[PDB]
Assembly symmetry: none
Homo-oligomer: 26 residues x 8
């Protein structure tokens, strides 16, 4: 019932993308 | 280059989703 | 029910976008 | 290049959503 | 149903836009 | 260009929404 | 039942706009 | 580069999904 996410960059990387989705499909 | 996000649900989460992208298009 | 997000830059940007939404499909 | 936002709900809700996008030249 | 948003700029800015809505629609 | 806004509901509410954009026209 | 908003423009020529409304539609 | 994400299932593990990609296309 609880979710958490964090992103940290320490370098000049290229394109970066992140996505997350929670639910309960049956 | 530093971003963080967190969610919190007490009762019940129906459907939560999050997405992020850097650089985009131009 | 409760959601929070924060961004922090540490260098240089150009094109970035972020979006989040709570409550979706069960 | 510094922005922050937070939302707080007392009881319940239908569906909250937030989105942000930074630019540079246009 | 409380929401707050704040942004800060170093100096010049253009092409940056942000929007948020609470209790939207599913 | 610094701007900040906050809202507070006592309870009875339909749907609050806020949007802002920098760089363009007034 | 309380809402407040404030903005300031000075960075280079003007070109910023913001709007907020409480109580949309059920 | 340092990023971490965690989520909890309501008791099914078949409706929740998450994906992330760094240093994608230039």
């Amino acid at each position: 019932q609880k979710l958490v996410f964090f992103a940290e960059n320490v370098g000049s990387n290229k394109g970066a993308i992140i996505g997350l989705m929670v639910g309960g499909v049956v």
